[PDB]
Each structure stands twice: as structure tokens, then as C-alpha cells.
Design an enzyme around this catalytic site. Sequence first.
Site, short mmCIF file in Angstrom:
data_model
loop_
_atom_site.label_atom_id
_atom_site.label_comp_id
_atom_site.label_asym_id
_atom_site.label_seq_id
_atom_site.Cartn_x
_atom_site.Cartn_y
_atom_site.Cartn_z
N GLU A 148 0.82 -1.21 0.00
CA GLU A 148 0.00 0.00 0.00
C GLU A 148 0.85 1.26 0.00
O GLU A 148 1.69 1.44 0.89
CB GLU A 148 -0.99 0.02 1.16
CG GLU A 148 -2.15 0.97 0.94
CD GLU A 148 -3.23 0.85 1.99
OE1 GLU A 148 -2.92 0.46 3.15
OE2 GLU A 148 -4.39 1.17 1.66
N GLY A 282 3.14 0.85 10.23
CA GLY A 282 2.67 0.41 11.54
C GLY A 282 2.15 -1.00 11.47
O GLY A 282 2.42 -1.83 12.35
N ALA A 283 1.40 -1.26 10.40
CA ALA A 283 0.69 -2.51 10.17
C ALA A 283 -0.04 -2.37 8.84
O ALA A 283 -0.26 -1.26 8.36
CB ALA A 283 -0.29 -2.78 11.29
N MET A 284 -0.41 -3.51 8.25
CA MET A 284 -1.00 -3.54 6.92
C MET A 284 -2.08 -4.62 6.84
O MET A 284 -1.83 -5.78 7.14
CB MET A 284 0.08 -3.75 5.86
CG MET A 284 -0.42 -3.64 4.44
SD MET A 284 -1.59 -2.27 4.28
CE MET A 284 -2.42 -2.76 2.78
N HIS A 318 -7.95 -1.72 14.64
CA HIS A 318 -7.85 -0.97 13.39
C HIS A 318 -7.74 -1.91 12.19
O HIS A 318 -8.50 -1.78 11.22
CB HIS A 318 -6.64 -0.04 13.44
CG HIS A 318 -6.55 0.92 12.28
ND1 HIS A 318 -7.02 2.21 12.35
CD2 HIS A 318 -6.03 0.77 11.04
CE1 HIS A 318 -6.81 2.82 11.19
NE2 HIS A 318 -6.21 1.96 10.38
N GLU A 319 -6.80 -2.85 12.26
CA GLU A 319 -6.51 -3.75 11.15
C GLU A 319 -7.69 -4.65 10.85
O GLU A 319 -7.92 -5.03 9.70
CB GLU A 319 -5.26 -4.59 11.45
CG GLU A 319 -3.98 -3.77 11.64
CD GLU A 319 -3.78 -2.71 10.58
OE1 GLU A 319 -3.95 -3.03 9.38
OE2 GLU A 319 -3.45 -1.57 10.94
N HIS A 322 -10.54 -3.01 8.82
CA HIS A 322 -10.23 -2.99 7.41
C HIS A 322 -10.74 -4.21 6.65
O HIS A 322 -10.99 -4.13 5.45
CB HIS A 322 -8.74 -2.83 7.18
CG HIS A 322 -8.27 -1.41 7.20
ND1 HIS A 322 -8.79 -0.44 6.37
CD2 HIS A 322 -7.30 -0.81 7.92
CE1 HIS A 322 -8.17 0.70 6.60
NE2 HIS A 322 -7.26 0.51 7.53
N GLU A 341 -9.42 4.60 5.80
CA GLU A 341 -8.65 4.97 6.99
C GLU A 341 -9.45 5.66 8.08
O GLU A 341 -9.21 5.43 9.27
CB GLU A 341 -7.42 5.79 6.61
CG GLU A 341 -6.43 5.05 5.72
CD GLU A 341 -6.04 3.69 6.27
OE1 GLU A 341 -6.04 3.48 7.50
OE2 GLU A 341 -5.71 2.80 5.46
N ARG A 808 7.06 8.05 2.59
CA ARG A 808 6.40 9.17 3.27
C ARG A 808 7.07 9.56 4.59
O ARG A 808 7.05 10.72 4.99
CB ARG A 808 4.87 8.99 3.38
CG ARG A 808 4.39 8.16 4.56
CD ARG A 808 2.87 8.08 4.59
NE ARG A 808 2.38 7.21 3.53
CZ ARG A 808 2.22 5.89 3.63
NH1 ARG A 808 2.50 5.25 4.75
NH2 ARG A 808 1.78 5.21 2.58
N1 LIG Z 1 -3.16 1.24 6.63
C1 LIG Z 1 -1.86 1.20 7.37
C2 LIG Z 1 -0.78 1.99 6.62
C3 LIG Z 1 -0.39 1.39 5.27
C4 LIG Z 1 0.81 2.06 4.64
O1 LIG Z 1 0.92 3.30 4.72
O2 LIG Z 1 1.65 1.35 4.04
C5 LIG Z 1 -2.00 1.68 8.82
O3 LIG Z 1 -2.23 2.86 9.10
O4 LIG Z 1 -1.89 0.89 9.76
ZN LIG Z 2 -5.74 1.72 8.34
#
Ligand SMILES: N[C@@H](CCC(=O)O)C(=O)O
Ligand SMILES: [Zn+2]
Length: 875
Positions: A148, A282-284, A318-319, A322, A341, A808
Site C-alpha cells: 500500500e 505500523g501494520a497492513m 484498526h486492522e 479494514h 482509513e 512518506r
Molecule cells: N493502513 C496502514 C498503513 C499502510 C501504509 O501506509 O503502508 C496503517 O495505518 O496501519
Molecule cells: Zn488503516
Amino acid sequence: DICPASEDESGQWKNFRLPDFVNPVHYDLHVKPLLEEDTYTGTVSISINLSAPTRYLWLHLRETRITRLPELKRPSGDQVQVRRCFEYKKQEYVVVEAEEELTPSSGDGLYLLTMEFAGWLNGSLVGFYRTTYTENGRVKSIAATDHEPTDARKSFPCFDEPNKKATYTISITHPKEYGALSNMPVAKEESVDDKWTRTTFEKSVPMSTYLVCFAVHQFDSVKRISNSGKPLTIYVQPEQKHTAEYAANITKSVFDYFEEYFAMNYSLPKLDKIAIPDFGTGAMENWGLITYRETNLLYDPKESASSNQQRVATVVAHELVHQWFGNIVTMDWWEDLWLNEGFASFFEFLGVNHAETDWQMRDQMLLEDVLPVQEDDSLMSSHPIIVTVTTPDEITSVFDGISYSKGSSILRMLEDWIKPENFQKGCQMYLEKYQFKNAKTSDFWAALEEASRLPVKEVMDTWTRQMGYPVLNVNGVKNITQKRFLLDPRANPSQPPSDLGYTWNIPVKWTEDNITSSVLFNRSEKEGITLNSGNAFLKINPDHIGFYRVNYEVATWDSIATALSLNHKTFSSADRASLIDDAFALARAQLLDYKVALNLTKYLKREENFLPWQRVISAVTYIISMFEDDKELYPMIEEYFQGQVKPIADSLGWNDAGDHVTKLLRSSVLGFACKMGDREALNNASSLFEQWLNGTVSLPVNLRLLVYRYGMQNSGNEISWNYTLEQYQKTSLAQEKEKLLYGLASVKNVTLLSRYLDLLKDTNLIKTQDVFTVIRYISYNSYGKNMAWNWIQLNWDYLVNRYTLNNRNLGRIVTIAEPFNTELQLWQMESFFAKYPQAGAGEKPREQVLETVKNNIEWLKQHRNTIREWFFNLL
Ligand SMILES: N[C@@H](CCC(=O)O)C(=O)O
Ligand SMILES: [Zn+2]
Ligand SMILES: *[C@@H]1O[C@H](CO)[C@@H](O[C@@H]2O[C@H](CO)[C@@H](O[C@@H]3O[C@H](CO)[C@@H](O)[C@H](O)[C@H]3NC(C)=O)[C@H](O)[C@H]2NC(C)=O)[C@H](O)[C@H]1NC(C)=O
Ligand SMILES: *[C@@H]1O[C@H](CO)[C@@H](O[C@@H]2O[C@H](CO)[C@@H](O[C@@H]3O[C@H](CO)[C@@H](O)[C@H](O)[C@H]3NC(C)=O)[C@H](O)[C@H]2NC(C)=O)[C@H](O)[C@H]1NC(C)=O
Ligand SMILES: *[C@@H]1O[C@H](CO)[C@@H](O[C@@H]2O[C@H](CO)[C@@H](O[C@@H]3O[C@H](CO)[C@@H](O)[C@H](O)[C@H]3NC(C)=O)[C@H](O)[C@H]2NC(C)=O)[C@H](O)[C@H]1NC(C)=O
Ligand SMILES: *[C@@H]1O[C@H](CO)[C@@H](O[C@@H]2O[C@H](CO)[C@@H](O)[C@H](O)[C@H]2NC(C)=O)[C@H](O)[C@H]1NC(C)=O
Ligand SMILES: *[C@@H]1O[C@H](CO)[C@@H](O[C@@H]2O[C@H](CO)[C@@H](O)[C@H](O)[C@H]2NC(C)=O)[C@H](O)[C@H]1NC(C)=O
Ligand SMILES: *[C@@H]1O[C@H](CO)[C@@H](O[C@@H]2O[C@H](CO)[C@@H](O)[C@H](O)[C@H]2NC(C)=O)[C@H](O)[C@H]1NC(C)=O
Ligand SMILES: *[C@@H]1O[C@H](CO)[C@@H](O)[C@H](O)[C@H]1NC(C)=O
Ligand SMILES: *[C@@H]1O[C@H](CO)[C@@H](O)[C@H](O)[C@H]1NC(C)=O
């Protein structure tokens, strides 16, 4: 060299965006990593629904090369003549020109494109990559993917857009000592050699490329079973197995809660979680195989803090959100990223609140998302929730406070206005409507509008298609009017141009004498409205539920101060936090005299709640920051705020006792005491630090960070720095490692901080994932503010080469300049930025920190005397 680069613009591949008339249905994907070579090869066969005459077929590919001339198949099954293939760099495409055009798959028959590709596993945390860890003295390997938003194209050639949903059957040929994981369960395992195993996974449901994930690992597992009867398992290094327990608990609890709440089944037969030892975010939320950075997944009750516990619970929650919002229903284009998000950032608090009952999670939304992002979104260099993005760098940039926190905040406002019950049902209907497809923001409005018949689109568009938010100005207790709230009073309030003209439809709530009433404040009410018990005091925006600020008359503000000094409990803890947060933000924007804001702090010796203290500390941190080098103001501010925390700091003490929120409060309250120079808090820190250096004593988990930081700051030297560095290497727990890094960054020694900065180039010592964390920690050091800033400038080319302008976190590292407040420092920043003008994903952060630094300079000019008078007269 078989599919070479050309600068040929004359074709539809010059378009950034993929063409309308080509769609993928199915991917047959095979990959074979050569782990100890840091390479992989693979083949992909893609079924293609063509819709228009085209002599060209193109799709995304970056860095990874095509090795064999691609093969094209007609819906009938015939072999297609292919003249050339080539790469078009500017838009990250590989293009193959057929001899002739042939036209749409009209009747269930599809095209089939086959490509052979080779790529690297080294030097990177995106795409498909390998990292190592140590187990019983041995260096072991794990390979995983991370995509991502635009990195699936590094792993394998594909239609790398969120709306080009296709189905997947993935296979991996690996060494037999390893297991292979992916989105779906294992289907069949077959021996290639006595050394190699080919693991084929069962067909996926339709999904976006960024969600495709595979891993090759030798991890142990902790297991749980859902109410659905599906296996929920967390993969973890054997030596770390015991720290996977808590995440397993929350996964169960929150998985079972969400399935019921969304009235929809989790789409896959299993769910896996795994922390990669070196991991870029952080996590995906990869469909069925969620990847983590260890600090966000692995928790030890005997060594980790309550802070850590909550972080693990929240990211897991959170994960999981999704798996519905994002996975089942995905945004059509990245402009609507908040649909993923924001939704995950909102529902995470609901998940964890179910799992952990006395955490006051609903209140903590104010501390975590709402109040912080109201800072962000008061800048000219903010952006609207629905964001125009035209490059991969712009796409990755919007994974920010706006998509997440403002997303969360305006859903929090929306839910309350529309009522929880109807919000729930409305989400459910949207979820069944767009299941395994893509939605736009208009689609979510239309769905909730069917749950309330309230004017959702009309009201929520104002919050979504323009940046910023309003301040409600109170005239005569009862009359309100709206104006855009900007931190810079000199900024032009009509810029950048907005169809909506920076007026909002504001769902307004207020409390009269413990009874609550509601109005929608219409945009077209240009001269404001009047709020409908003959009244003396009117509490507007209870619990700061709406995404706006309230500026009462000065008389009212004065009365609030006195009311707090007499009996502060008259207000709810959230209401105290909110009033304090608004006053100080209003003072920052020159909309309220600082004396009025500061007056609200007089009562603090009797403040005992988490939320108010957090927002007090936030406001004071900034003011104290601006006067760091003012030998006249600083000691006065320090002396004051030292006295205001002393009672609660003493009352709570240096010991882990009480419930979750009390323990969180103790951390930040003792931290502030230390920060403000309290001799007795600093001594506790140094005393505990000295004990910890003796090698046995295990520190109280919620005090560790403070002890490492202030202990290293006050009594650290080379001997104890070296020891702390040893300890950091020796501990397996990532959450401890991260604390020790903050400790190392706290030493008051240029030579040692210089050694520390040098270690950033050493991948045996600092992981690629932690580099920006360490730089940021060092920037907080009185000496290292300038050292980190200097180091990123001298080493900019090195960082760009190592991370790419698309990363980023590299883009954001310039925000270490936020505390800058002089024309000299602003000149440095501008000089550096003019020297390296290709900012990539750093474009917005640069704009933001420049705005912040200018505000800082102005702020000092406007408020130094006023603030001085207030403190001098009091002391
Ligand atoms: N959706 C992910 C971030 C994914 C990414 O920026 O690679 C999160 O905020 O945990
Ligand atoms: Zn997220
Ligand atoms: C993950 O989930 C578990 C429940 O789903 C947590 O509960 C643990 O298991 C025990 C029973 O399931 C609990 O029983 C006992 O509690 C009482 C306290 O009044 C005492 O007898 C014992 O301390 C405890 N039994 C033991 C230690 O055998 C426990 O409360 C509880 N804890 C432990 C260590 O077993 C798990 O705690 C939870 N794990 C994590 C890491 O969150
Ligand atoms: C860690 O921090 C603690 C504070 O949170 C320290 O405990 C406090 O020490 C103070 C001085 O030793 C005491 O304050 C005052 O002491 C003078 C001595 O002359 C007395 O007159 C005062 O009556 C007394 N103040 C009060 C309000 O009674 C504190 O009483 C004392 N305890 C508390 C609970 O605040 C620890 O000393 C410190 N530990 C280390 C190792 O530095
Ligand atoms: C809201 O803030 C107001 C502005 O600061 C407060 O009013 C001020 O109270 C001060 C007390 O701390 C006064 O200072 C004293 O008076 C004079 C100043 O000229 C000095 O000689 C004295 O030394 C000083 N007192 C001491 C003990 O040192 C200010 O006079 C006064 N300022 C103004 C402009 O009125 C309000 O009290 C406050 N409102 C609240 C808390 O509700
Ligand atoms: C992974 O490592 C390989 C080689 O170990 C890198 O490719 C080399 O790149 C350098 C210059 O950048 C050249 O001197 C070598 O000739 C290259 N070797 C080969 C075999 O091509 C590769 O760039 C690394 N990958 C990443 C993403 O950094
Ligand atoms: C910061 O740390 C450095 C490195 O340890 C200190 O320099 C050492 O000082 C001791 C005693 O004066 C000498 O024996 C060592 O030879 C020095 N080491 C090095 C590498 O130069 C320095 O004094 C400290 N600076 C402070 C505390 O301001
Ligand atoms: C603390 O750690 C450092 C790094 O291991 C020690 O080693 C010295 O490091 C410098 C570079 O910073 C080298 O130039 C020296 O040659 C190193 N000394 C050696 C190899 O003996 C340092 O000695 C340690 N200090 C203490 C007090 O333990
Ligand atoms: C949804 O869940 C219910 C209850 O567990 C189950 O009976 C049903 O088969 C599920 N729907 C699917 C798998 O499509
Ligand atoms: C508030 O608005 C009402 C209705 O427009 C008006 O009567 C009143 O004079 C206004 N001003 C104040 C100070 O209440």
C-alpha cells in the site's frame, strides 16, 4: 534489456491513470525466492476483459524487470503476434504492442497475458523483500510483501489500482525448511526436489492489488478460534511466542464483536497475523494475512507499559476494521482514502472499548484523533478530506492526519447527530451494497441518508469537500455565528478557492442545566442562528463532539475560570479538556487574549483526570517550547506549571497502581513534572535509573520510559550509555528496544549523540524501520534539535538513495523543524529546501512545517509581552 525503456509519449500509456477499457479478472501468480541470494523470479498469467480496439496492453511494473517477451492469448485460445515490448518510466508502465488490435471479450471468454519477471529482495521495505533475525545464535530469514499504496507493482507486474479488483490464486516455490503464507488457506503442497516445496493457495475472493500478500517464514504460532469457527492465528518467533498472547486475545474479542456489529461475515476461511522483524509502516491489512511492526503486535505484561497494551489493542482493532471497510468495500480511487482509513480510525475505538471496558476509549478519541487533528486542520497547508492526487508521491502523501483523524472525527460527529443506531444500520447497508466492489464518498452519504432521511449529503459535503473547520462565535450567551478558524490571523480565509466558501452545515449540540438540545446550523443562515428555561450559562459542543471550536464571550470565559477554581467537577472531564483546548488554540490564533486562556489553568492543583491533563500538557508544551531560550520567561513558566502538577504527581507516586487510565495519567503527569524541572521527580528518575544500571531490578513498566529518558538526561555518561546500548541489542521485546532508543537519545553529550547518529548508517545496529524514529528522538534533545536537523541535511542524498522520494516517512522527517521560531532558522529551512527542491512525498510536510515556523515567529512577536505580564504579575 528485452523490454527496454523508451520515451514514446504517443499512446494512452502517457496517461497517469489506467484506461477504462481493460479489466483484470484473475491472476495466476507464481514466485520463487532465492533467499540467500536476495533475488526472486516469478511468472504471472492475467485474464483480461478488453472493451475497445487497442494495439497496446499496458500495466504497472517498477524496478522489477521483465525477463522474457510476454505472451498473449485470445478468448478462443490462439497465440497473439507480439512485435515489441517496452517500459515507459514516467508513469511506471510496461507496454506490449501486438501486431494487430483485437476487440472485447464479449462472451465469458477473456484474454490471457503471461509475463516472466525477476526482482530483488534487498535494500527495501516495499514490494517483496527479505529481512533477518537471530534465533539461538543463528541468522534466520523471513520474506514478506508490503504494497500500500503503489508497491504491488514492484512485487509483480499488475493493474496496480484499487478499483481493478481481480481474483487471485498464488503459489510459492520455497525451501522445505520454510512455511509459506498468503491471503487464503493452503490448498496443496507438492515436492519439487528433496530440497524445495511448491505451496499453492486456494482461489481468493475479488480484491485490490495493494491487498495481495505472501510470506516465507519459520515462525511458531499462537492459535485462536472465532465464533464463526474460523482459525485466527498469530505467527511469532519462537523466543517471542509468549508475547503473542495478548494480541491473540484482542483479535478474538474484536473479530467476534465486528462480525456482529457490521452484520456481515468475514469473507475468508482464515485470518493470520504476523510481525515482520523489519517493517516499513505500523501494520497492513492484507486480506487474511495482516502484517505488523513488532511494537504494534507483540506485548509482554511483565515488561510492556499500559501505553503499549493500548497501542497493540488499537492497531489490531484498526486492522480488523479494514477486513470490512477497505477489504470488502474499497474506495474507488485514493482521493476517497478516508473511506478506508477514517472508518478504521473510528471503529478501532469501538472494537477496543468492547474488549477493554474500563479504558474510557470513547473519551480517548479526543486525545488521539480529534484535538490533535484540529491543530493540523487549522493550517492553510491542510487539505480537504476528498483529495486530488495525480502521482504515486501524492497518493502516498495523503496517508495522514486528515484521512485518519479528521476522517474519524467527522464520523464521530456524524454518528452522534444521526444517532448510533441509524449510523450502524446505515453502515451495514453500504457494506452489503458495495460488497466486493468500489464505492465513492457520495455512495456512503446516499446509504446513511436511507437510514435517517436527514440531509446527510448536504451537511456532510461541507465537511468533506473543503479543508478546515469553523469557530462558533458567541454573542450574548445565545447568539452564534460561524467563521473559519485559522491559526494564522494574517492568512486569507477564502484560500484556496472553495465552491462552499468556507461555511459549514454544523450539527450543533448544547447543554442547558443537564438537559441537551440539538440544531443544524445551515450555511445559508449568513447572519447566524439563535439557540432555543431562561438562561445564565450555556455549554456548547458537549464532549467536543462536533468538529469545531467555540469562542464564548470574554465574560463567560472569565466565569468559567472562576467556576473551575471553585468546583471543577461541575464540568465533565472531556468538557474541561475541550474548553482548555479551545481557549489555548483561540489564544494561539489571536482570537482570545492569552490572559483569559492562562486563567483557566489556575485551578489545576486540584485536577485529577486524564483528559484535561493531557490537553493542558499539550498546550503548555508548545508555549514552553517557544520560550526555551528566553532566560526571563522560561523559569517563570517552569516554576508555575511545576506547582500546578506537583500535587497530582505526588498523589499518584512512583509506582504502578490503579486502573488503566490512572496508570496512563501517572506516566504523563510524572513526565511533565520531570519536564518542568521538579527536583523530586528528577531524583526519582535518577535513583531508579541508577538501580536499573545495577542489572537486576526490573523497572515498573509504566515508569521505564521516564526513567530511561530523565535518568539518562540527568546522570547519563559514556559508561551508562554503552550499557544502555548493550541492553537494547540484548532485549528481544521491540517495545523495550524503542524505549531504550529514546533513552540513548536523551544523553546530554554531543560526542555520544554523534556516535548515535553514525549508527543510523549501520543496519546491524539500527533497523531500517527505526531510522526515522531515532532521528526524531534525537531532535527532541536540547543539543540534538540542531544535530538531527544538521545530519539530515548533510546526509540527504544518502537518505533519498536508501528510502526513495516516495517514502512518506522520509518526506515527513523535515517536521523535526516544527519547534523553529526565528527568521534565521526559517532561512536555513528555505535554503535547504531550495537546494533539494525535488521533495517527492515530502512536498506537503515541507509546506506544513514552513507554515508552522512562520506562525511561530509571528506568535513570539505578538504574545511575548502579554504572556510575560501574566506570569510576572502572578509569581
Ligand atoms: N493502513 C496502514 C498503513 C499502510 C501504509 O501506509 O503502508 C496503517 O495505518 O496501519
Ligand atoms: Zn488503516
Ligand atoms: C488472554 O485470555 C485469557 C482469558 O481468555 C486471560 O485469562 C487468564 O486465564 C485464567 C483463566 O482463563 C485467569 O484465571 C486466574 O485469575 C485469578 C485471579 O483472581 C487467579 O486465580 C489466577 O491469577 C489466574 N489463573 C492462573 C494464573 O492460572 C487469569 O486471570 C488469566 N491470566 C493468566 C496469566 O493465566 C489471559 O490473561 C489473557 N492473556 C493476556 C496476555 O492478556
Ligand atoms: C521522589 O519524589 C517524592 C515526591 O513525589 C519525594 O518524597 C517527598 O520528599 C519531600 C522532601 O524529602 C517531602 O517534602 C517535605 O519535606 C520537608 C522536610 O523538611 C517537610 O518539612 C515537609 O512537611 C514535606 N512536605 C509535605 C507536603 O509533607 C515529601 O513529604 C515527600 N513525600 C511525598 C509523598 O511527597 C521522594 O523523596 C523522592 N524520592 C527520591 C529517591 O528522590
Ligand atoms: C484573568 O487574568 C487577569 C490578567 O492577568 C487577572 O488579573 C490580574 O491579577 C493579577 C494577580 O496575579 C494582578 O497582579 C497584581 O497587581 C499588580 C499589577 O500591576 C502588581 O503590583 C501586584 O504585584 C500583582 N500581585 C501580586 C500578588 O504580585 C493584576 O493586577 C491583574 N491584572 C489585570 C489586568 O487586572 C485576573 O485575576 C484573571 N481572572 C481570573 C483568574 O478569573
Ligand atoms: C540489491 O543488491 C544488488 C547487488 O547486490 C544491487 O545491484 C547492484 O547495484 C550496484 C549499483 O547500484 C551495482 O554496482 C551492481 O553491479 C549491481 N549488481 C547487480 C547484480 O545488478 C541492487 O541494486 C540491490 N537492490 C536494491 C533495491 O538496493
Ligand atoms: C561526553 O562524553 C565523552 C565521551 O566519553 C567524554 O569524553 C571523555 O572524557 C573522559 C574524562 O574526561 C576521558 O577519559 C575520555 O578520554 C573522553 N572520551 C572521549 C572519546 O573523548 C566527555 O567528557 C563528555 N562530555 C561532557 C560530559 O560534557
Ligand atoms: C563505549 O563504546 C565504544 C564503542 O564500542 C568504545 O569503543 C571506542 O570507540 C571509538 C569510536 O567511537 C573508537 O575509535 C575506539 O577505538 C574504541 N575503543 C576501543 C576499540 O577500545 C568505547 O571505548 C566505550 N567506552 C567505554 C567507557 O566503555
Ligand atoms: C454467514 O454466517 C452465518 C452464521 O455463522 C452462516 O450460517 C452463513 O453460512 C454465513 N454466510 C456465508 C458463509 O456466506
Ligand atoms: C441576538 O439575536 C436576536 C435575534 O436576531 C436579537 O434579538 C438580539 O438583539 C441579538 N443580540 C444579542 C446581544 O443577544
